Amino acid sequence: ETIEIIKDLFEHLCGVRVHRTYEDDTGLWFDTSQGSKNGIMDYKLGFVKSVDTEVIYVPLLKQRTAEELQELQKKLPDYLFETLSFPLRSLNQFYIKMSKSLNK
Amino acid sequence: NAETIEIIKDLFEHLCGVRVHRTYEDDTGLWFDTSQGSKNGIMDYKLGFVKSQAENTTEVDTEVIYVPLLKQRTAEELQELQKKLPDYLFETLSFPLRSLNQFYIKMSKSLNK
Amino acid sequence: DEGFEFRRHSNLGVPTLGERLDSLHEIKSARRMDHFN
């Protein structure tokens, strides 16, 4: 079992790639990419522990061309265009929301 | 959650709802003993990847083998899944790697029913 | 010889100076949401 083997599995399984990661003083952070042929969204997930764990979602529009972001504008609810905080128990719900939005 | 690989697997378990319990490779391919689900229901299954060498390239062809694990589930849990999941998810299935995300989506929508 | 306080970290990676800044800003400005039902 290697990290590359796990990352490969989940790329093909649930369409999520992890690109860059780091731990700073606030928590654990993951530059993340999600989607398929229909649409792709890049974003940052941060896990900050206070013990309860909060997730910070940061949308990343730089990699998107002008055309795929006007599609993104139609597919995404407004909150997925803004930086969010939510408890860890809702992460899967978040993934499903993002999947359904991209798949539109 | 000290080791980096545990952190990665914890991330995907909370994000995609899939826990990988074991990873191994024997003469039958590369295998993952997994669980997928949440409060709404859990499905235990093995994912197998059978790499066959392509004719003209180092790029391997991959076939996925899905083996559902029902033997250790209770009859009560097994009848709860039967209402949510189509019959083929109770059988051993094989399909190309490219269909793996569709399999996962079909699994996820069934468990969330 | 009095010892010191520290904090443990994983090997997930050292951030840049900018990413440290980004994290604080993103936490501070994040909109709270409870679920996505």
Numbering used by the authors:
A (entry chain A): 69 to 118, 126 to 179
B (entry chain B): 67 to 179
C (entry chain C): 29 to 65
What does the study report here?
We therefore screened paralogs from several related budding yeast, and successfully purified a complex between the Candida glabrata (Cg) Csm1 globular domain (residues 69–181) and the Dsn1 Box 1-2-3 region (residues 14–72). We identified crystallisation conditions for this complex and determined the structure to 2.3 Å resolution. Our structures of the Cg Csm169–181:Dsn114–72 and Cg Csm169–181:Sc Dsn171–110 complexes reveal a consistent interface between Dsn1 Box 2-3 and Csm1, while the Cg Csm169–181:Dsn114–72 structure reveals a second interface between Csm1 and Dsn1 Box 1. In the crystal structures of both Cg Csm169–181:Dsn114–72 and the chimeric Cg Csm169–181:Sc Dsn171–110 complex, the Dsn1 Box 2–3 region wraps around the Csm1 globular domain, with Box 2 forming an α-helix that packs against the “side” of the Csm1 dimer, and Box 3 binding the Csm1 hydrophobic cavity. While Dsn1 Box 2 forms an α-helix and associates with the “side” of the Csm1 dimer, Box 3 forms an extended conformation that packs tightly against the Csm1 conserved hydrophobic cavity. Our structure of the Cg Csm169–181:Cg Dsn114–72 complex shows how Dsn1 Box 2-3 binds Csm1, but also reveals a plausible Csm1 binding mode for Box 1. In the structure, Dsn1 Box 1 extends outward from the Csm1-Dsn1 Box 2-3 complex described above, and interacts with a crystallographic symmetry-related Csm1 monomer. Interestingly, Box 1 is oriented in the opposite direction across the Csm1 hydrophobic cavity than Box 3, with positively charged residues (Cg Dsn1 R35 and R36, equivalent to Sc Dsn1 K75 and R76) C-terminal to the hydrophobic residues, and negatively charged residues (Cg Dsn1 D29 and E30, equivalent to Sc Dsn1 S29 and P30) N-terminal. Thus, both Dsn1 Box 1 and Box 3 bind the same surface of Csm1, through similar but distinct interaction modes.
